[PDB]
Design a protein around this ligand. Structure first.
Ligand SMILES: Cc1cc2nc3c(=O)[nH]c(=O)nc-3n(C[C@H](O)[C@H](O)[C@H](O)COP(=O)(O)OP(=O)(O)OC[C@H]3O[C@@H](n4cnc5c(N)ncnc54)[C@H](O)[C@@H]3O)c2cc1C
Ligand SMILES: NC(=O)c1ccc[n+]([C@@H]2O[C@H](COP(=O)([O-])OP(=O)(O)OC[C@H]3O[C@@H](n4cnc5c(N)ncnc54)[C@H](OP(=O)(O)O)[C@@H]3O)[C@@H](O)[C@H]2O)c1
Length: 435
């Protein structure tokens, strides 16, 4: 918690570089990758965007990965936002000097009570600008409790009262939060009478979390590179008259220039790797950006075939998107992979195709691949991988359970048990893109 005269900023001469600071803060080895290129994957006439990102690992062995793994990425908040926030600070040193945070530690029933300054040691030594851009979350709306604290900092009665109403965290708060999705700087601007101490924000804001992305490349096909498939998150606030808010990491990845440092790390996904046995059938289900890990899969299989002399069992891809002319990302690539024997068949379920009835990936599974799915999973030691949206994944599970009841001639209960065992045996895989 925070209180006046509890924290102070102190100038210091030494400071680690970004990747070291992040490593120290998050207690894990963060590495420095480089942006090689970025390309838009959807049609320019699309209302949305998905970008293809190519990163170079600088030959750093700590960034070794296998198809199916994830890459945690640390983005930077937008500078205009960082600058605007610093401008609303009450006692902020120029934001270009390296400082550390010290906290007045007081002790107990020690009869007189003894205070002692010492390093808080949350953030590493850095400038205020660097702290707000690379280490802290300045975008997540403040909690009712934070607004309560903000109320005691407002010098305008009317504003204090409003803040106090919101601090109740009920109807008024929900309306405010859900309608405005206010960033920290936005709150200070709505209530300009708030006297915001730099130390409060520097110690109370949460740490900026890394964002995970399913690696979209095979390490053999692209040595020293890591590819990502990123949906661009952008949204209108206040029903339309409010400003447009952009996802922090996706917008950052959409802004960086070639050579810019991208702090990241690999997080292995032991339960989302291709099978050790190349001869069993695999069915890949990944609509939209959910196709991401499967790009690493088809590149690896293509490489294994053409360079390792392997003859793996051809896989099946079940993709889905809105329209053939808008968001059918990686279309030509999957086509070429099929031509080289990686895939036996490709399927695409279009949901908003002009003059075409809506189709979801689960529809393809049930209407065109029911017997195939059943034979692969039950009789051929096969695997099924599902990647993407959480609701889609849940719906696909249901479709597979239905296939098991019909094709397998099982009761609801036993179909569920079978699927549960598939998960346990690591033959049913899920890569869900959670919030
Ligand atoms: C294991 C794992 C793998 C993943 N792989 C991928 C991948 O390969 N490709 C990919 O694109 N994503 C992937 N995701 C998502 C990714 O990690 C990020 O969560 C996503 O890119 C958004 O990050 P951001 O920083 O851009 O957004 P943030 O700034 O964190 O904001 C995201 C938040 O924006 C808010 N938001 C979005 N639209 C609206 C709206 N209309 N109204 C109000 N609020 C809104 C929500 O609160 C939302 O959760 C994965 C997630 C996990 C857990
Ligand atoms: N599509 C989603 O699953 C979903 C849900 C909430 C937010 N988002 C956001 O949209 C961006 C793109 O995500 P995305 O690439 O994963 O998805 P997406 O591009 O929005 O959608 C891909 C395909 O999945 C279909 N779909 C939607 N709900 C489904 C379900 N329950 N079962 C099967 N298919 C379903 C979509 O159809 P229709 O949309 O036409 O119905 C579309 O054809 C992200 O930024 C993400 O956070 C996506």
């Amino acid at each position: 918690s925070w209180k006046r005269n509890k924290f102070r900023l102190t100038y210091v001469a030494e400071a680690p570089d970004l990747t070291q600071g992040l490593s120290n803060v998050h207690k894990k080895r963060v590495s420095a990758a480089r942006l090689l290129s970025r390309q838009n994957l959807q049609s320019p006439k699309s209302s949305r965007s998905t970008i293809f990102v190519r990163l170079h690992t600088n030959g750093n062995q700590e960034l070794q990965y296998q198809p199916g793994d994830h890459l945690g990425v640390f983005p930077g908040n937008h500078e205009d936002l960082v600058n605007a926030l610093i401008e609303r600070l009450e006692d902020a040193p120029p934001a270009n000097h390296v400082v550390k945070v010290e906290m007045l530690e007081e002790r107990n029933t020690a009869l007189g009570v003894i205070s002692n300054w010492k390093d808080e040691s949350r953030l590493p030594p850095c400038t205020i600008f660097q702290a707000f851009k690379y280490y802290l979350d300045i975008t997540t709306p403040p909690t009712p409790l934070q607004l309560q604290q903000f109320a005691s900092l407002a010098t305008n009665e009317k504003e204090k009262q409003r803040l106090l109403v919101l601090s109740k965290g009920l109807q008024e708060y929900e309306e405010w939060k859900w309608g405005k999705n206010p960033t920290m700087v936005e709150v200070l601007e709505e209530f300009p009478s708030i006297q915001m101490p730099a130390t409060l924000l520097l110690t109370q804001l949460s740490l900026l979390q890394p964002r995970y992305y399913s690696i979209s490349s095979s390490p053999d096909m692209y040595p020293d590179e890591v590819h990502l498939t990123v949906a661009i998150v952008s949204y209108h606030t206040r029903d339309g008259e409010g400003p447009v808010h952009h996802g922090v990491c996706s917008s950052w990845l959409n802004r960086i220039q070639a050579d810019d440092v991208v702090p990241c790390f690999v997080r292995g996904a032991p339960s989302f790797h291709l099978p050790r046995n190349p001869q069993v059938p695999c069915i890949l289900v990944g609509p939209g950006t959910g196709i991401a890990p499967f790009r690493s899969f088809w590149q690896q299989r293509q490489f294994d075939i053409q360079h390792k002399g392997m003859n793996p069992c051809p896989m099946v891809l079940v993709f889905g998107c809105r329209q053939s002319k808008i968001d059918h990302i990686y279309r030509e690539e999957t086509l070429q992979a099929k031509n080289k024997g990686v895939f036996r068949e490709l399927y695409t379920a279009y949901s908003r195709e002009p003059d075409r009835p809506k189709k979801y990936v689960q529809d393809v599974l049930q209407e065109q691949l029911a017997e195939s799915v059943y034979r692969a999973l039950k009789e051929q030691g096969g695997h099924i991988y599902v990647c993407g949206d959480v609701t889609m994944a849940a719906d696909v599970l249901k479709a597979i359970q239905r296939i098991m009841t019909q094709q397998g001639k099982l009761s609801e209960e036993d179909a569920g048990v079978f699927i549960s065992r598939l998960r346990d045996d690591n033959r049913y895989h899920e890569d869900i893109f959670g919030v």
